[PDB]
Amino acid sequence: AKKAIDSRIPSLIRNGVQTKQRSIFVIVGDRARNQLPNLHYLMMSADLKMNKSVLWAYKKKLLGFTSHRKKRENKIKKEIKRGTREVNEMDPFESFISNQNIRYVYYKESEKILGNTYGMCILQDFEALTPNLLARTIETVEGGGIVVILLKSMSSLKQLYTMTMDVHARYRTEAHGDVVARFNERFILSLGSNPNCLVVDDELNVLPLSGAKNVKPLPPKEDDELPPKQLELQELKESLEDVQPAGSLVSLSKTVNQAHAILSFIDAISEKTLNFTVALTAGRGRGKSAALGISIAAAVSHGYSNIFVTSPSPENLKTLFEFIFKGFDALGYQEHIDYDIIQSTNPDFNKAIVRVDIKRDHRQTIQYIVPQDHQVLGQAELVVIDEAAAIPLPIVKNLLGPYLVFMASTINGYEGTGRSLSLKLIQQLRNQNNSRQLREISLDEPIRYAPGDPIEKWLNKLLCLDVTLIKNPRFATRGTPHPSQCNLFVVNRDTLFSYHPVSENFLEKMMALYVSSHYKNSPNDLQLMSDAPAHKLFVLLPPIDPKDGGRIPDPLCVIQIALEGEISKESVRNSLSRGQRAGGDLIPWLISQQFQDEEFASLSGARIVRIATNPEYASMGYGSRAIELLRDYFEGKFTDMSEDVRPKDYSIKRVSDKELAKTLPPLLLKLSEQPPHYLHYLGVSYGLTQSLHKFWKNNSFVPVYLRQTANDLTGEHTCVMLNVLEGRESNWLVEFAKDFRKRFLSLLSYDFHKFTAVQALSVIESSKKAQDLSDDEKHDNKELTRTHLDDIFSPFDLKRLDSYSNNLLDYHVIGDMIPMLALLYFGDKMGDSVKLSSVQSAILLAIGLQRKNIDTIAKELNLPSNQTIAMFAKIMRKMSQYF
Amino acid sequence: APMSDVGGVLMDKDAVYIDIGGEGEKLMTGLQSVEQSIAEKFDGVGLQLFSNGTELHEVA
RNA sequence: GAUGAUUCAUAAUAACUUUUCGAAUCGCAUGGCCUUGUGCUGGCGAUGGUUCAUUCAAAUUUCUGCCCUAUCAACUUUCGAUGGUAGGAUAGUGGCCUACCAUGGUUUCAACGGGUAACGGGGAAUAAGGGUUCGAUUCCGGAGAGGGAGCCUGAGAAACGGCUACCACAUCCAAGGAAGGGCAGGCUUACCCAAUCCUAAUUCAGGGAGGUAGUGACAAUAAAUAACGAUACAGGGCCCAUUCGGGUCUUGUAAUUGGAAUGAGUACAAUGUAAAUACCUUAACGAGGAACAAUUGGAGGGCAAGUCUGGUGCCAGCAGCCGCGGUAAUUCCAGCUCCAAUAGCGUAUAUU
RNA sequence: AUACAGUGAAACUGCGAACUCAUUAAAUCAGUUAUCGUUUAUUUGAUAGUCAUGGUAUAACUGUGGUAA
C-alpha cells in the first residue's frame, strides 16, 4: 500500500532547494527508472520556480523504453486492441516521459549540451562514466537540482557490496589483463565522502553507506533573510541605479565578481587608452562571456566604431554573441532596426554570426577575425581575444599591439589544456606588463549554483581539477637535492586510486605537477592512467630524510609509460575477443606506415606519455636524471641479478564470485622490487619546440618522424624520437634516421619553411646522432663522381659558378644554382673536403632548402645583409674550389 | 493536486508516502543492515608509504 | 455455309512473328486384366488453357417527344464549319485527329440568343382501396475527394488506390531527417448478420449494405381521481324583483355507519426476438383521509384592547400575515363562503 | 505417417476490392433502334493428337547490425 519513505530524502532535496545547492542520488536496482518521477516531483513540490528540464545521458540504448512519441502511442494503441491495457491508464513513468521536457543525449555527444542548463540530470549507465562526461553534465545541472546515477548492473552492485563491507577488498572477477575500473571504484568510495549524496535502492530505502545519512531538515527560511553575496549584489545594484547608463548592465551581472570585472572593463573603455590591457581569467560557469558582452555593450555606448573579436572558432563565441545581444537590448538596440546580423558565408562555421553592424549614431562594426590574421588589426580600436590560452602562444605574441586588449582565459577549466595554457599565458602576461599596462581580474563565483557547492567540491576533488602546485618549505629549507641523490620509484596504481587520504594528497601533488608541466591536458587522462593495463607510473623522489619521520614526500618528476609492441599484442587479442580494441600502440603503427618494416612489429618498446618536472625548479637536471634512471631500470641495472627473490605481487586481494557466495599495498615501490619485461626501445611523441628538442637530444633520443602539418591547437609539429636500449641492434634505428634525414631535407621546402635554420640544423644533428652512435663504420656517404656532377650540373652552369666565385655575375643568376648545391652539402656526398661554419651552414640551408629571402635570413641572424652576402660568397667560393 | 495523491506520492506535513509498486536481494539487505560508513572505515584503514615503512592511518 | 444483304462464316496457297496455345498440377477411390509383371491401365471430381457462341455490362447510334421571348435574325469555317481522298488513333464507326482538295452546312415555319425561382421535370414511379388532384418510390445532370499537371493496375476507372514533379498548409525530431490529408455539433451510441441480398479459394467467412434497441412532454390521445346503501338530527331550502314584496316545496347536516368493486401500482411466469426491449396473455399483492393527498381562475365577505389618514363629538376613508402575553406556544371566521373550466387553466400584445 | 498424410500461425499464390460543391431547355432525360461498326472477369453450351517427370530464385525463418524513428 503506502509506505512512508525515509525522512532523509525529502530533507535532502528541500535543503538543496533552500541553500541553492545540488544533490546527487544513486538508485540501485531495476526500478530506478520507476523511482525517477518521485524525485522529480519532490524537486518541483519543493520549488515552483525550479527549472523543469530533464537531461538523460545514456551510452547505447534507452533503459526499457523509447523516445519516439508516435512509436509509444502506436504500441499503446496496439495494446488497447489486444486488450491488455485499459483505455485510459498510464504508468507514472510513462506519464513522466510523455509530459516532461527531456533532452536525450549520448555519452559521446556531450559537447552539444554545454550551453544548456537543466533542472535534473540522469546518468543511465554507470560503467561507462568518463570524467569529461561527468563534468559536462554536472556543470549543466542548476542549483537545487538532482543528479541521479542508475546502478542496474549486477557486477557494479557486487563491487559496491564488497567494497562497503571491506574498503580494502575489491571485486575483480573473471578479469585477465584488461581494463580495471579503478576510477569507478574511487568514484564509489568518494560518494561516501560527499555530503549531498544518497544511495538508495529501487524501493527508496536509504543505504547507510552514503555521506548524507546524518542529514537533518533545515529550518524554514526567512523571506527577509538573503545570502550575503546577494546582499552585496543589492548594494552594487544600488550603486548601478545611481550610475547611468551602465547601471542596467551592472544589474544584469549576476555575481559581484562579474560586477567588479565589468567595472574594470568600463574603466578601461573610459580611459580609451591603447596601451591598456585587461586580462580576465575565469572558472567555467562564471560568466566571463557575460562580462565581455557587457564590455562590448559598454564600448558601443562609449561610441567605439571598431570592435575585433578573435577566437579559435566561433562556437566558442556564440555565447558571447547572445550576451552582447542582450547588452544591446538593455542599452536600447534592436534587431532589424538599429543593428543587423550578417552570418557566416563559410559553411564550416555553421552560419555563425561573423558581422554585427550598428546603424544608429556613427557606423559601428563588431567583427569576428581569424587569430593568425593580424595585418587587418592596424585599424583596431577594441579587440577581445577570447580563449587566448587556446590560441597558440606565438600567435598571441604577434597579436599584441597598440589597441585596447581584453583577454579571456579559462583558469581551472574542465579541459586541462585550458588551465595549463592559462598558467603559461599568465607568465606571458607578466612578460607583457613589463611597456603596456595590464590589469588582471579573476572570476570564481558560479551563477548557476551557490558558492561552496558540495557537488562541485566533490567533483573537483575527484577529478583533481583544482589541484594547484605549491612550493615545499621543507625542500626549500633543506635546499635543492642533488639529482644523483634523487631516486626513482614505481607507483602502485591500485593503492594510488584506493582513495586513502594519504594517497589522495600524493595524487594531488602528481596531478599538479602533470598539469603545471604540460600545456595539453584532458580529464580523460586520469581515467587513462588509472584503467589502462599497459600504463605504468614512475616518480622521482628526493633522498629520504629521517627528519621527515614518515611524512608525505613531494614528487620532483613524474613519468608515464605506455607499453607498445609485441607484449601488447596478447592484450589486443583479448580486447578483440571482448569487442573493441582501445588504441594499443601508436609508435609501432606510425613506424609501420612511414617505413615498411616487419621487424618493428616484432620489436617491443615503451613510449613516454608525459615527463613532468616542477616549473619552480629551473635547470635542476631532474628530468634528465629521471630519464637516465628509467633507461637503467629498463636495461636491468637496478634489477637484482638473483632470481631467488620472491616476486611479491602487491595486487589487492580480489574477491571472487565464489568468495561472495561463501593491509593495503605500498604506495611507492623500489625499482628492484619489480623486474621489467624485455623492452627494445624507448620512444617519445611530442610537439616540436626548441627546449624540448634540446632536452631529448641531451637524453640522446634520435628523431625518426616529424609530422607534416602542425596541430591546430598547439601550432607545433609532432615529432617522434626513439632510443635503443643496450644489447639491442641499432641498425634499424640508423636506417630510420638516415631516411628521416633525407625526408627532412626534402620537406624543408614546404611546411617546414617557417622553422628557423638553427632549429633545422638542430634536427639534422639529432638525426646524425644515430650515425655517430653507430658502431659500424662500413656505411658512409659515397663521394660525388665527376660523371654524376656533369649529370646534375651543366658545364656552363659550373662556368657561371666560377664566374660568381670571381664575383663577375650577380645573385639573381646564382639563385638557380643554390638549392641543388645545398642538398648536396647537407647530404654530405661531396665529402669532408669543405667544412662550413654553423652560421654559414644556416645561411645555406635557409636559402636553399627553406627557400627563404636573404633579407629575412639577415633579420633572423641579426646580421648585416652585406655581411651575409659576403659570407655566402665565401661559401660558394669554397664550393667552386671543391668543384 | 498538491494536497491529493498524484501518481504515488502523497504529502502530509513534512512526510512523503510513496506506493511500493535472490543473492542480489540478500546482499541489498546486508547493505541495509550495515551501519558503518566507508569514510570511518577509511579512518581505520592505514597506508604504507614504502615497501618497509611506518604505516600511517591519517595524513599529518 | 449463312443472311433481305457482305471482301461474313469456313476451306485453301506462299510467307511472316522479339507470337502464342497445344496440362511436368491437386484429392477421393485401389480399378480391371494376367504379364504377377510390382507390367497394363481404372473410375468420380478440382484448378487450368485455346477459339467461337451465350450471359453480364458498356460504348457509340437512330427516330420520337419539355418553358417564356424578336424589348433577340442571322448562325457556322473564332478547338474544322459542311463534304471528299489517304493516314494516324481507338475496342470499333466517325473530321476523332492530320495532310491535300473542293466548298458547304442551319434557318423568320424563329436558326440563334436571353431569362427560367431548371431543389426542376420525367404517367419515372407505386398509388390516391371515397384527400378534389394527395401520398410514397425512382432518374436529378456534372465535377471533386488540399489545389494544377503527368503516369500506373484491371474484363470494367482517365480510380474515394498508389507514384513523380510543382504549389500551399501542417506534424514529430536528438535539428542530421521523417511522415501526413476530414466529417459531424452549437448559435456522433449499443447489439447483430436471424431476416433481405451481395461479395470471396467459398455452405461455414464478411458486409456502420441491412436489421434491432436507446435517449427524444411538444402537435394529441383513451381512462381514473369513486360507486351503492343505511341511520340520526334539524326546520327551513330555493326562485324572481328598484324597493314594497312576490312565487314555491322533502330540504338541510364539516352528522354517524355498513359492507361490496377495482384501476394506478408492486410483481411471478410464459410468449416474443440473433439476444433483449416493447406488445399480447398473465398468477400473487394492491383503498376510508379511499394521505394511492387535481389543478387553474373568478366573485364576495367577516374579525382586533392592532395601524394609518381626514373631519362640524360616537364618523368617514384607506386598509389590516404586524394585536399583549406566548412558538409546544396556540386549536382558533372548525381550513370564511360561493362560482366556473378540468389534465388542463390563466396573462400580455396583435388581428376578424 | 520408416516421403508427406490430423489441425494449422506466418508467408507465397489466386479472386474480389469499378460525402461535398456547381444548374444545362434537341442538352439532359424518356422510349426507340442499330453494332454486316465494337470490347469480356464471370455464367452457360461447344471446342485441342499433328517424360517413372527439367532448372532456379526467394518469402516466412535463422542469425549480425544501423538509426531519435
PDB file of N, CA and C in Angstrom, chain A residues 349-420:
ATOM      1  N   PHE A 349      31.730  27.239 -40.384  1.00  0.00           N
ATOM      2  CA  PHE A 349      31.363  27.971 -39.180  1.00  0.00           C
ATOM      3  C   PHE A 349      29.920  27.731 -38.760  1.00  0.00           C
ATOM      4  N   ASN A 350      29.154  26.980 -39.561  1.00  0.00           N
ATOM      5  CA  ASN A 350      27.762  26.613 -39.272  1.00  0.00           C
ATOM      6  C   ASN A 350      26.875  27.845 -39.097  1.00  0.00           C
ATOM      7  N   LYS A 351      26.976  28.775 -40.055  1.00  0.00           N
ATOM      8  CA  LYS A 351      26.178  30.007 -40.102  1.00  0.00           C
ATOM      9  C   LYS A 351      26.356  30.834 -38.827  1.00  0.00           C
ATOM     10  N   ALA A 352      27.596  30.924 -38.352  1.00  0.00           N
ATOM     11  CA  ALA A 352      27.880  31.706 -37.157  1.00  0.00           C
ATOM     12  C   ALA A 352      27.813  33.195 -37.466  1.00  0.00           C
ATOM     13  N   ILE A 353      27.472  33.985 -36.452  1.00  0.00           N
ATOM     14  CA  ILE A 353      27.390  35.433 -36.593  1.00  0.00           C
ATOM     15  C   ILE A 353      28.800  35.988 -36.740  1.00  0.00           C
ATOM     16  N   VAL A 354      29.159  36.433 -37.944  1.00  0.00           N
ATOM     17  CA  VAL A 354      30.513  36.939 -38.143  1.00  0.00           C
ATOM     18  C   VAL A 354      30.529  38.462 -38.123  1.00  0.00           C
ATOM     19  N   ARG A 355      29.464  39.099 -38.625  1.00  0.00           N
ATOM     20  CA  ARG A 355      29.440  40.546 -38.736  1.00  0.00           C
ATOM     21  C   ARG A 355      28.260  41.067 -37.924  1.00  0.00           C
ATOM     22  N   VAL A 356      28.497  42.111 -37.134  1.00  0.00           N
ATOM     23  CA  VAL A 356      27.437  42.814 -36.418  1.00  0.00           C
ATOM     24  C   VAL A 356      27.552  44.286 -36.785  1.00  0.00           C
ATOM     25  N   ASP A 357      26.522  44.826 -37.429  1.00  0.00           N
ATOM     26  CA  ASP A 357      26.543  46.216 -37.858  1.00  0.00           C
ATOM     27  C   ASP A 357      25.548  47.038 -37.051  1.00  0.00           C
ATOM     28  N   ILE A 358      25.974  48.232 -36.650  1.00  0.00           N
ATOM     29  CA  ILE A 358      25.161  49.135 -35.840  1.00  0.00           C
ATOM     30  C   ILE A 358      25.018  50.432 -36.623  1.00  0.00           C
ATOM     31  N   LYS A 359      23.761  50.834 -36.852  1.00  0.00           N
ATOM     32  CA  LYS A 359      23.453  51.911 -37.786  1.00  0.00           C
ATOM     33  C   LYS A 359      23.233  53.239 -37.073  1.00  0.00           C
ATOM     34  N   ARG A 360      22.625  53.222 -35.886  1.00  0.00           N
ATOM     35  CA  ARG A 360      22.379  54.472 -35.179  1.00  0.00           C
ATOM     36  C   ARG A 360      23.707  55.083 -34.746  1.00  0.00           C
ATOM     37  N   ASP A 361      23.716  56.415 -34.614  1.00  0.00           N
ATOM     38  CA  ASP A 361      24.925  57.219 -34.449  1.00  0.00           C
ATOM     39  C   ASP A 361      25.870  56.952 -35.614  1.00  0.00           C
ATOM     40  N   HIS A 362      27.175  56.968 -35.358  1.00  0.00           N
ATOM     41  CA  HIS A 362      28.139  56.622 -36.393  1.00  0.00           C
ATOM     42  C   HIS A 362      28.080  55.128 -36.692  1.00  0.00           C
ATOM     43  N   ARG A 363      28.670  54.734 -37.822  1.00  0.00           N
ATOM     44  CA  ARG A 363      28.737  53.326 -38.196  1.00  0.00           C
ATOM     45  C   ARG A 363      29.549  52.557 -37.162  1.00  0.00           C
ATOM     46  N   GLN A 364      28.994  51.465 -36.639  1.00  0.00           N
ATOM     47  CA  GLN A 364      29.759  50.632 -35.720  1.00  0.00           C
ATOM     48  C   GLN A 364      29.791  49.191 -36.206  1.00  0.00           C
ATOM     49  N   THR A 365      30.957  48.557 -36.080  1.00  0.00           N
ATOM     50  CA  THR A 365      31.140  47.184 -36.523  1.00  0.00           C
ATOM     51  C   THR A 365      31.745  46.348 -35.406  1.00  0.00           C
ATOM     52  N   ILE A 366      31.175  45.154 -35.233  1.00  0.00           N
ATOM     53  CA  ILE A 366      31.695  44.116 -34.350  1.00  0.00           C
ATOM     54  C   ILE A 366      31.931  42.889 -35.220  1.00  0.00           C
ATOM     55  N   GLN A 367      33.189  42.537 -35.453  1.00  0.00           N
ATOM     56  CA  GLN A 367      33.521  41.522 -36.443  1.00  0.00           C
ATOM     57  C   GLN A 367      34.419  40.431 -35.873  1.00  0.00           C
ATOM     58  N   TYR A 368      34.124  39.189 -36.264  1.00  0.00           N
ATOM     59  CA  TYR A 368      34.951  38.052 -35.875  1.00  0.00           C
ATOM     60  C   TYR A 368      36.099  37.876 -36.859  1.00  0.00           C
ATOM     61  N   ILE A 369      37.299  37.649 -36.333  1.00  0.00           N
ATOM     62  CA  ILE A 369      38.517  37.599 -37.136  1.00  0.00           C
ATOM     63  C   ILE A 369      39.291  36.329 -36.813  1.00  0.00           C
ATOM     64  N   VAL A 370      40.095  35.889 -37.775  1.00  0.00           N
ATOM     65  CA  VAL A 370      40.947  34.704 -37.625  1.00  0.00           C
ATOM     66  C   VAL A 370      42.129  35.051 -36.726  1.00  0.00           C
ATOM     67  N   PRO A 371      42.491  34.202 -35.756  1.00  0.00           N
ATOM     68  CA  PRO A 371      43.630  34.518 -34.872  1.00  0.00           C
ATOM     69  C   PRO A 371      44.968  34.672 -35.577  1.00  0.00           C
ATOM     70  N   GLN A 372      45.233  33.885 -36.623  1.00  0.00           N
ATOM     71  CA  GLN A 372      46.512  34.001 -37.319  1.00  0.00           C
ATOM     72  C   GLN A 372      46.605  35.302 -38.108  1.00  0.00           C
ATOM     73  N   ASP A 373      45.467  35.857 -38.513  1.00  0.00           N
ATOM     74  CA  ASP A 373      45.460  37.139 -39.201  1.00  0.00           C
ATOM     75  C   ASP A 373      45.708  38.259 -38.198  1.00  0.00           C
ATOM     76  N   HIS A 374      46.690  39.108 -38.501  1.00  0.00           N
ATOM     77  CA  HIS A 374      46.972  40.276 -37.677  1.00  0.00           C
ATOM     78  C   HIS A 374      47.221  41.546 -38.474  1.00  0.00           C
ATOM     79  N   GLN A 375      47.332  41.466 -39.801  1.00  0.00           N
ATOM     80  CA  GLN A 375      47.616  42.653 -40.604  1.00  0.00           C
ATOM     81  C   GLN A 375      46.385  43.538 -40.749  1.00  0.00           C
ATOM     82  N   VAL A 376      45.195  42.968 -40.554  1.00  0.00           N
ATOM     83  CA  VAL A 376      43.970  43.764 -40.602  1.00  0.00           C
ATOM     84  C   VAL A 376      43.753  44.493 -39.282  1.00  0.00           C
ATOM     85  N   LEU A 377      44.580  44.196 -38.278  1.00  0.00           N
ATOM     86  CA  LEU A 377      44.426  44.810 -36.964  1.00  0.00           C
ATOM     87  C   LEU A 377      45.054  46.194 -36.876  1.00  0.00           C
ATOM     88  N   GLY A 378      45.423  46.799 -38.005  1.00  0.00           N
ATOM     89  CA  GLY A 378      46.059  48.105 -37.957  1.00  0.00           C
ATOM     90  C   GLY A 378      45.081  49.226 -37.670  1.00  0.00           C
ATOM     91  N   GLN A 379      43.787  48.946 -37.801  1.00  0.00           N
ATOM     92  CA  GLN A 379      42.757  49.953 -37.592  1.00  0.00           C
ATOM     93  C   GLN A 379      41.788  49.440 -36.532  1.00  0.00           C
ATOM     94  N   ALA A 380      42.339  48.901 -35.448  1.00  0.00           N
ATOM     95  CA  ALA A 380      41.573  48.221 -34.413  1.00  0.00           C
ATOM     96  C   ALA A 380      41.453  49.128 -33.200  1.00  0.00           C
ATOM     97  N   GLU A 381      40.216  49.452 -32.817  1.00  0.00           N
ATOM     98  CA  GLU A 381      40.026  50.193 -31.576  1.00  0.00           C
ATOM     99  C   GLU A 381      40.030  49.256 -30.376  1.00  0.00           C
ATOM    100  N   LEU A 382      39.023  48.387 -30.273  1.00  0.00           N
ATOM    101  CA  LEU A 382      38.932  47.441 -29.166  1.00  0.00           C
ATOM    102  C   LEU A 382      38.898  46.026 -29.721  1.00  0.00           C
ATOM    103  N   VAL A 383      39.723  45.147 -29.157  1.00  0.00           N
ATOM    104  CA  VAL A 383      39.800  43.759 -29.580  1.00  0.00           C
ATOM    105  C   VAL A 383      39.630  42.894 -28.341  1.00  0.00           C
ATOM    106  N   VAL A 384      38.735  41.920 -28.428  1.00  0.00           N
ATOM    107  CA  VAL A 384      38.583  40.892 -27.410  1.00  0.00           C
ATOM    108  C   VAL A 384      39.206  39.615 -27.953  1.00  0.00           C
ATOM    109  N   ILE A 385      40.252  39.143 -27.281  1.00  0.00           N
ATOM    110  CA  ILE A 385      40.896  37.882 -27.642  1.00  0.00           C
ATOM    111  C   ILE A 385      40.354  36.818 -26.684  1.00  0.00           C
ATOM    112  N   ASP A 386      39.349  36.088 -27.156  1.00  0.00           N
ATOM    113  CA  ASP A 386      38.703  35.082 -26.333  1.00  0.00           C
ATOM    114  C   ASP A 386      39.404  33.741 -26.491  1.00  0.00           C
ATOM    115  N   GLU A 387      39.575  33.051 -25.359  1.00  0.00           N
ATOM    116  CA  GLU A 387      40.307  31.786 -25.267  1.00  0.00           C
ATOM    117  C   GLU A 387      41.722  31.933 -25.821  1.00  0.00           C
ATOM    118  N   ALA A 388      42.418  32.964 -25.336  1.00  0.00           N
ATOM    119  CA  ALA A 388      43.779  33.219 -25.793  1.00  0.00           C
ATOM    120  C   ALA A 388      44.734  32.130 -25.325  1.00  0.00           C
ATOM    121  N   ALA A 389      44.373  31.419 -24.253  1.00  0.00           N
ATOM    122  CA  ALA A 389      45.116  30.220 -23.884  1.00  0.00           C
ATOM    123  C   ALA A 389      44.991  29.151 -24.960  1.00  0.00           C
ATOM    124  N   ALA A 390      43.787  28.975 -25.510  1.00  0.00           N
ATOM    125  CA  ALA A 390      43.600  28.024 -26.600  1.00  0.00           C
ATOM    126  C   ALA A 390      44.273  28.509 -27.878  1.00  0.00           C
ATOM    127  N   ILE A 391      44.386  29.825 -28.043  1.00  0.00           N
ATOM    128  CA  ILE A 391      45.185  30.363 -29.150  1.00  0.00           C
ATOM    129  C   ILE A 391      46.652  30.023 -28.910  1.00  0.00           C
ATOM    130  N   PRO A 392      47.405  29.595 -29.928  1.00  0.00           N
ATOM    131  CA  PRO A 392      48.835  29.321 -29.730  1.00  0.00           C
ATOM    132  C   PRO A 392      49.610  30.567 -29.316  1.00  0.00           C
ATOM    133  N   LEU A 393      50.648  30.345 -28.513  1.00  0.00           N
ATOM    134  CA  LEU A 393      51.387  31.430 -27.866  1.00  0.00           C
ATOM    135  C   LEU A 393      52.117  32.381 -28.819  1.00  0.00           C
ATOM    136  N   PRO A 394      52.888  31.926 -29.833  1.00  0.00           N
ATOM    137  CA  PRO A 394      53.498  32.913 -30.748  1.00  0.00           C
ATOM    138  C   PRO A 394      52.481  33.717 -31.535  1.00  0.00           C
ATOM    139  N   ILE A 395      51.306  33.134 -31.788  1.00  0.00           N
ATOM    140  CA  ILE A 395      50.218  33.870 -32.426  1.00  0.00           C
ATOM    141  C   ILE A 395      49.773  35.018 -31.530  1.00  0.00           C
ATOM    142  N   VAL A 396      49.713  34.769 -30.219  1.00  0.00           N
ATOM    143  CA  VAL A 396      49.361  35.818 -29.262  1.00  0.00           C
ATOM    144  C   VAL A 396      50.439  36.897 -29.231  1.00  0.00           C
ATOM    145  N   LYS A 397      51.712  36.476 -29.258  1.00  0.00           N
ATOM    146  CA  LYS A 397      52.818  37.432 -29.245  1.00  0.00           C
ATOM    147  C   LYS A 397      52.794  38.332 -30.474  1.00  0.00           C
ATOM    148  N   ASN A 398      52.488  37.764 -31.641  1.00  0.00           N
ATOM    149  CA  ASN A 398      52.320  38.580 -32.841  1.00  0.00           C
ATOM    150  C   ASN A 398      51.069  39.448 -32.735  1.00  0.00           C
ATOM    151  N   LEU A 399      50.034  38.940 -32.068  1.00  0.00           N
ATOM    152  CA  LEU A 399      48.757  39.632 -31.978  1.00  0.00           C
ATOM    153  C   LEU A 399      48.798  40.846 -31.063  1.00  0.00           C
ATOM    154  N   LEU A 400      49.741  40.902 -30.123  1.00  0.00           N
ATOM    155  CA  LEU A 400      49.866  42.071 -29.257  1.00  0.00           C
ATOM    156  C   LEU A 400      50.223  43.321 -30.060  1.00  0.00           C
ATOM    157  N   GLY A 401      49.575  44.443 -29.729  1.00  0.00           N
ATOM    158  CA  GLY A 401      49.804  45.688 -30.428  1.00  0.00           C
ATOM    159  C   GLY A 401      49.106  46.890 -29.812  1.00  0.00           C
ATOM    160  N   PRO A 402      49.288  48.074 -30.426  1.00  0.00           N
ATOM    161  CA  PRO A 402      48.722  49.345 -29.907  1.00  0.00           C
ATOM    162  C   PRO A 402      47.222  49.493 -30.147  1.00  0.00           C
ATOM    163  N   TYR A 403      46.449  48.819 -29.299  1.00  0.00           N
ATOM    164  CA  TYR A 403      44.992  48.799 -29.339  1.00  0.00           C
ATOM    165  C   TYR A 403      44.475  48.249 -28.019  1.00  0.00           C
ATOM    166  N   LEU A 404      43.201  48.521 -27.716  1.00  0.00           N
ATOM    167  CA  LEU A 404      42.653  48.066 -26.443  1.00  0.00           C
ATOM    168  C   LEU A 404      42.469  46.554 -26.467  1.00  0.00           C
ATOM    169  N   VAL A 405      43.027  45.879 -25.464  1.00  0.00           N
ATOM    170  CA  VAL A 405      43.085  44.423 -25.427  1.00  0.00           C
ATOM    171  C   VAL A 405      42.264  43.930 -24.244  1.00  0.00           C
ATOM    172  N   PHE A 406      41.274  43.087 -24.528  1.00  0.00           N
ATOM    173  CA  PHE A 406      40.531  42.383 -23.494  1.00  0.00           C
ATOM    174  C   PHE A 406      40.778  40.896 -23.684  1.00  0.00           C
ATOM    175  N   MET A 407      41.593  40.308 -22.817  1.00  0.00           N
ATOM    176  CA  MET A 407      41.995  38.920 -22.974  1.00  0.00           C
ATOM    177  C   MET A 407      41.087  38.064 -22.106  1.00  0.00           C
ATOM    178  N   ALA A 408      40.667  36.917 -22.635  1.00  0.00           N
ATOM    179  CA  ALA A 408      39.802  35.992 -21.917  1.00  0.00           C
ATOM    180  C   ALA A 408      40.519  34.661 -21.770  1.00  0.00           C
ATOM    181  N   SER A 409      40.627  34.185 -20.535  1.00  0.00           N
ATOM    182  CA  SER A 409      41.279  32.919 -20.252  1.00  0.00           C
ATOM    183  C   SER A 409      40.444  32.137 -19.253  1.00  0.00           C
ATOM    184  N   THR A 410      40.498  30.816 -19.376  1.00  0.00           N
ATOM    185  CA  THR A 410      39.719  29.916 -18.537  1.00  0.00           C
ATOM    186  C   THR A 410      40.662  29.193 -17.584  1.00  0.00           C
ATOM    187  N   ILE A 411      40.816  29.742 -16.382  1.00  0.00           N
ATOM    188  CA  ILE A 411      41.571  29.047 -15.350  1.00  0.00           C
ATOM    189  C   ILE A 411      40.685  27.981 -14.722  1.00  0.00           C
ATOM    190  N   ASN A 412      41.299  26.845 -14.373  1.00  0.00           N
ATOM    191  CA  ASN A 412      40.623  25.685 -13.778  1.00  0.00           C
ATOM    192  C   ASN A 412      39.475  25.196 -14.663  1.00  0.00           C
ATOM    193  N   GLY A 413      39.670  25.298 -15.976  1.00  0.00           N
ATOM    194  CA  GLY A 413      38.669  24.796 -16.901  1.00  0.00           C
ATOM    195  C   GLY A 413      38.652  23.279 -16.903  1.00  0.00           C
ATOM    196  N   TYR A 414      37.546  22.704 -17.402  1.00  0.00           N
ATOM    197  CA  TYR A 414      37.423  21.247 -17.399  1.00  0.00           C
ATOM    198  C   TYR A 414      38.450  20.627 -18.331  1.00  0.00           C
ATOM    199  N   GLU A 415      38.652  21.224 -19.500  1.00  0.00           N
ATOM    200  CA  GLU A 415      39.783  20.826 -20.320  1.00  0.00           C
ATOM    201  C   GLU A 415      41.049  21.389 -19.697  1.00  0.00           C
ATOM    202  N   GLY A 416      41.972  20.490 -19.364  1.00  0.00           N
ATOM    203  CA  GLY A 416      43.127  20.891 -18.580  1.00  0.00           C
ATOM    204  C   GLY A 416      44.141  21.666 -19.391  1.00  0.00           C
ATOM    205  N   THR A 417      44.072  21.537 -20.720  1.00  0.00           N
ATOM    206  CA  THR A 417      44.898  22.375 -21.576  1.00  0.00           C
ATOM    207  C   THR A 417      44.538  23.843 -21.398  1.00  0.00           C
ATOM    208  N   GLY A 418      43.274  24.123 -21.058  1.00  0.00           N
ATOM    209  CA  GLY A 418      42.872  25.484 -20.759  1.00  0.00           C
ATOM    210  C   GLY A 418      43.600  26.065 -19.563  1.00  0.00           C
ATOM    211  N   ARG A 419      43.650  25.327 -18.449  1.00  0.00           N
ATOM    212  CA  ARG A 419      44.286  25.895 -17.263  1.00  0.00           C
ATOM    213  C   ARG A 419      45.807  25.889 -17.379  1.00  0.00           C
ATOM    214  N   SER A 420      46.381  24.886 -18.050  1.00  0.00           N
ATOM    215  CA  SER A 420      47.835  24.871 -18.202  1.00  0.00           C
ATOM    216  C   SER A 420      48.311  25.984 -19.134  1.00  0.00           C
TER     217      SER A 420
END
